[PDB]
Amino acid sequence: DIQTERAYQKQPTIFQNKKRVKLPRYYKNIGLGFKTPKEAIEGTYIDKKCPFTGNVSIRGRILSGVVTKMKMQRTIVIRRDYLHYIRKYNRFEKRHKNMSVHLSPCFRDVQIGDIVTVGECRPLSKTVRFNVLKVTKAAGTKK
Amino acid sequence: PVARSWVCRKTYVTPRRPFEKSRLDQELKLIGEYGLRNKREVWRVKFTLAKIRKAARELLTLDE
Amino acid sequence: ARGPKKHLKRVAAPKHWMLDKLTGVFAPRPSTGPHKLRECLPLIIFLRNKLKYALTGDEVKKICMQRFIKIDGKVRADITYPAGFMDVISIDKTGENFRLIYDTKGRFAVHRITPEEAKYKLCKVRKIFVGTKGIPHLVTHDARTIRYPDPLIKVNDTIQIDLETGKITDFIKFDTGNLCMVTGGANLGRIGVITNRERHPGSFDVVHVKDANGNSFATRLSNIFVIGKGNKPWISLPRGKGIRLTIAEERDKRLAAKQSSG
Amino acid sequence: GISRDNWHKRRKTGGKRKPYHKKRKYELGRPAANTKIGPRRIHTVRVRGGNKKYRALRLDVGNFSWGSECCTRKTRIIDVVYNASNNELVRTKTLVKNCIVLIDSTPYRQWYESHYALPLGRKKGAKLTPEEEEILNKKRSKKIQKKYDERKKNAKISSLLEEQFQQGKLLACIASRPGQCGRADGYVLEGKELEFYLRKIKARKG
Amino acid sequence: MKLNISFPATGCQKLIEVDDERKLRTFYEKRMATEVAADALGEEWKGYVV
RNA sequence: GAAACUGCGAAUGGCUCAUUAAAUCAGUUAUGGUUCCUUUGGUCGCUCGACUUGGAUAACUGUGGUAAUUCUAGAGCUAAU
RNA sequence: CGCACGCCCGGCGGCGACGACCCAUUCGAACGUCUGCCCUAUCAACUUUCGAUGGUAGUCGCCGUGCCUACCAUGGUGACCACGGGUGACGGGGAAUCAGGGUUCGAUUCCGGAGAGGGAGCCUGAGAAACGGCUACCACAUCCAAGGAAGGCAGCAGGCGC
């Protein structure tokens, strides 16, 4: 199911060819009181940039956005809305800044409109500097 | 990059209306009474009390 | 620029040096050393401006090039050498000993000590580190490495070193009800008793400190230096004992002393 | 020369950047080593901070580790088989990190034989006339045989490694960048990796 | 075309000018650092190699 | 103590504002993703295998070329952190 | 390498300078995070197989990354003004004016950036794409025994031109 590309997909930490007579999984708690989810501990994907089961460390900023598009692979576009205060007219103006964000295959069923918390880490790509730490499903979505 | 002040300041403000009979006739009495030599001698001191009155006001508005 | 800078313009120099505007263009760019450039006091500024032994740069050079000045029991013939917080300047021929500690305001005090007190200093630990063969290392605030420390000392404790041997005598552990001087921020030189440490995972931990007159002030944990157990200072404190009375009180004390003086 | 910077290319949106400064040194780029298989050739490069960086230009030996039973031996590289990145790097047989190379099986065979008291490689019927291998497989004292019989209990190698040993060329993956450090250190392919790579080269075979 | 000739054994040196084609003609189209017989330059230098 | 070999500095300072419109820059943070002369404090018989070796070059002596320059070729001798 | 000169039957130790892989420290630099800029719609669509947005594997780099290759995927931005254009635009601390709001200015001594006539390439070094360093090519230009040779004031003075 995995190992679709040319090179062999594996977790570089663990050794998988111990002489004997299921594969163990590398994972870590990421601090700041975030819960290492179950698809990370139990699942069978290979992701360099998964913040729980991969080589990337969360440090600096922690922000939240709402999911806009999910079309490019293992990555989403979130949209961060705020108000900017002009001082001449004692009023605000509605602005937005949509940023590219790495979504782990851990967070399996995520829909658009979900309130996604992200954490800053080392530059992953040209435009990607953040990584999804948790997802809150949009108000309801029970039915 | 010279080691100097450049910190100067004007000590007088000239009045907006240049030819008020009331103001000309007022200020000349003070010049003759106290033996000042020009109108700037009066404008200087009008500016010093204007600053004092302004700083007094700004404090007099403050939350007690 | 294309490399490290060597000049320091007199306006861009740290303010607590209290440098005038019309003397020169440049200020003494402190040589690299144990303390930071913004948190030091160069040997030239301390010697010529505070004590006023020297009159000019040539006289400071002449005073120090005779091997007369001795910063932390080691002779220094360098005019721009950064003498910082918790140092023992030992001018030998006059028989004086000075310790650089923050005045009640954001400046260094000319604080004379006794030769018995001028044989140790009070260093804060910055990191504890495991060596090349399980040899534990300390690194203190003044860039001073000590290997084989006490196995108890941890990353915000204060140690007391002997100045010749350069080894730990005692240590004050970072916890509530310990005297701390503030060595950064607006509260620069306030002496008070630690009240509460508030952990902030990711951010800087903020520590609430209480003064001797029930005055309470906070500062981030980076800018704290414990100098005593309970309420007991382990060194001599400057006149005022890091209180910072209000401008209203400081006005009253000044003019009342003037009235009584005459 | 070659600039290695972000400001020469378009923004997240697709607008054109105007370069606010000319090319800097620290934004450097040197040509690719494209290290080949021949007799040892290394050139030194003075890099930023005044450190040294070794360009392996030709390289035939490397420190490979058959790390199933923890046996690593310096071994002679012969040729490259498969490469995940690009396919022309196998034609022009260049070493790059994460290549698939054949290595001399003899140091690993020697060790296995001298350790476990069993033969490896050595097809059926072939006469062992030299008989110094005889002294390595026979003539043990009293309790040493208790040691070598509790040892050879778990001497069982897998079939897919036995096949390669019988031929005389093991498959290994280069784990050290040969262009940067001037080396060819790697590890022998085993189990799941070995099955995956044997299949990929047979799909390449056709 | 002058000849600044030196003698290492003693360690002396003299500038001897030549104004003939056929005397120097032997030197011509010979590379630098080629030990040549200097007999043709004069009756003085009989069986000299320079 | 001239010269000369060696080490270091010449990347700071000074001048101007032509470029440059999320660029520069300012406040806030990150390097757990790096490099660092110098300063300061550590390390510097932790390795199981000569009471001081080697051969050149400069200055200096000497002979030159060019209308020309902080240009330099050839010769004989002698140092090192 | 330098001042000291010692300690018992030929023996026989302090105090300094210089050097040196690594670690920390200092001075930094470099690359990222979040928010913020003047006028323009007679600029409404823009980007992309010669990288535009992602994925895997490398190459290069002091390191993180389309920085650059190979093979995949079809993305990324926009009426909340993208894309293009203008600027008599280096940015900020600040400056003049002001009841309160505000408008205009900021080349200019402090911090940051850029450049050395126009572009490009590199040597040495911890640090430079360095110009009071080198190598060409465009523009300009000095001395020529006619072969060759040496250039760079937006450093301080000063001269033409404007």
DSSP string for B1-64: ---------------SSTT-HHHHHHHHHHHHHHT-SSTHHHHHHHHHHHHHHHHHHHHHTS--
Residue ranges of domains in chain D: 1-30, 31-105+169-205, 106-168
CA B36 to C1' G119, whole Å: 70
**Nearest CA-CA distance, residue A19 and chain C, Å:** 32
Whether residue A13 lies within 8 A of chain D, CB to CB, comes out as no
How far is Cα of residue C102 from the mean position of the Cα atoms in its chain? Answer: 6
Closest CA to D173 of D87, D74, D64: D64
Comparing alpha-carbon positions, the chain D residue that sits nearest to A127 is D12
Comparing alpha-carbon positions, the chain A residue that sits nearest to C201 is A32
The C-alpha atoms of residue B26 and residue B3 are separated, in whole angstroms, by 45
DSSP 8-class letter at D6: S
Domains of chain A: 1-142 (2.40.50.1000)
| Backbone phi and psi for residue E8, each to the nearest 5 degrees, phi listed first | -60, -40
Half-sphere CA count of C97, side-chain side, radius 13 A: 15
Lookup: nucleotide whose C1' is closest to C5 CA: F12
Lookup: nucleotide whose C1' is closest to C4 CA: G28
**What are the C-alpha distances in Å from C45 to residues B3, B18, C9, C12, E17?**
19, 55, 15, 15, 74
**What are the C-alpha distances in Å from E28 to residues A40, B18, D67, D108, E4?**
86, 103, 71, 67, 16
Whether residue A68 lies within 8 A of chain D, CB to CB, comes out as no
Map tokens 């989403």 to a residue: A76
The C-alpha atoms of residue D111 and residue D156 are separated, in whole angstroms, by 15
- Note whether C25 contacts B5, CB cutoff 8 Å: no
- Note whether C23 contacts B3, CB cutoff 8 Å: yes
DSSP string for chain A: ----SSSPP--SSS----------------STT----HHHHH-----TT-SSSSS----S-EEEEEEEE--STT-EEEEEEEEEEETTTTEEEEEEEEEEEE--TTS-S--TT-EEEEEE-S--SSS--EEEEEEE--S----
Q: Does residue C100 contact residue C39 with C-beta atoms inside 8 Å?
A: no
Lookup: nucleotide whose C1' is closest to C2 CA: F11
Closest CA to A41 of A24, A56, A58: A24
Report the DSSP beta bridge partners of residue D104.
Answer: D169
What contacts D31, CB < 8 A, 6 or more positions away? Answer: D2
CA C82 to C1' G17, whole Å: 23
| Backbone phi and psi for residue C158, each to the nearest 5 degrees, phi listed first | -100, 140
First-to-last CA distance in chain D? 43
Comparing alpha-carbon positions, the chain B residue that sits nearest to C9 is B1
Chain C residues with beta carbon closer than 8 angstroms to that of B2: 25
- Note whether C22 contacts B2, CB cutoff 8 Å: no
> Which tokens sit at C76?
């220094």
Is A touching C (3+ C-beta pairs, cut-off 8 A)? Answer: yes
CA D128 to C1' G91, whole Å: 84
Is A touching D (3+ C-beta pairs, cut-off 8 A)? Answer: yes
The C-alpha atoms of residue E15 and residue D197 are separated, in whole angstroms, by 79
Taking one residue from A and the other from C, the number of pairs with CB-CB distance under 8 angstroms is 7
Which fold does the domain D106-168 belong to in CATH?
Phosducin; domain 2 (1.10.168)
| Backbone phi and psi for residue D55, each to the nearest 5 degrees, phi listed first | -90, 100
Torsion of CA E3, E8, E9, E12, to 10 degrees: 60
**Nearest CA-CA distance, residue B64 and chain C, Å:** 16
Chain D residues with beta carbon closer than 8 angstroms to that of A19: 68-69, 154
Torsion of CA B40, B44, B46, B50, to 10 degrees: 150
3-state helix, strand, coil in chain C (%, to 5): 15, 30, 55
Q: Provide the residue type at E26 as one letter.
A: T
Chain C residues with beta carbon closer than 8 angstroms to that of A59: 202
Whether residue D5 lies within 8 A of chain A, CB to CB, comes out as no
Half-sphere CA count of C129, side-chain side, radius 13 A: 13
Experimentally, the structure was elucidated by cryo-EM
- Tell me which residue in A3, A7, A127 faces D12 most closely, judged by beta carbons: A127
Chain A residues with beta carbon closer than 8 angstroms to that of C202: 32, 59-60, 62
- Note whether A33 contacts C202, CB cutoff 8 Å: no
Closest CA to A101 of A51, A34, A38: A51
Whether residue C12 lies within 8 A of chain B, CB to CB, comes out as no
Round the CA-based radius of gyration of chain A to a whole number and report it: 18
**What are the C-alpha distances in Å from A109 to residues A30, A114, A136, C227, E44?**
22, 11, 11, 56, 107
Lookup: nucleotide whose C1' is closest to D48 CA: G62
Spell out a b/e string for D93-104, using b for 16 or more CB atoms within 10 Å of the CB, else e: bbbbeebbbbbb
The C-alpha atoms of residue D193 and residue D114 are separated, in whole angstroms, by 27
Nucleotides of chain G in contact with protein CB (under 7 A) are 23-37, 46-48, 51-71, 73-84, 101-103, 109-116, 119-122, 124-131
**Nearest CA-CA distance, residue C42 and chain A, Å:** 35
Residue length, chain D? 206
Half-sphere CA count of E14, side-chain side, radius 13 A: 5
Closest CA to C44 of C35, C36, C56: C56
Map tokens 């091997």 to a residue: C67
CA A123 to C1' F33, whole Å: 8
**Nearest CA-CA distance, residue C137 and chain A, Å:** 27
Residue C32 falls in which region: left (phi positive, over 0), alpha (psi -120 to 50) or beta: beta
Q: Residues of A numbered 100-129 whose beta carbons fall under 8 angstroms of chain D's beta carbons: which are they?
A: 100, 126-127
**Nearest CA-CA distance, residue C11 and chain B, Å:** 10
- Tell me which residue in A3, A15, A17 faces D196 most closely, judged by beta carbons: A3
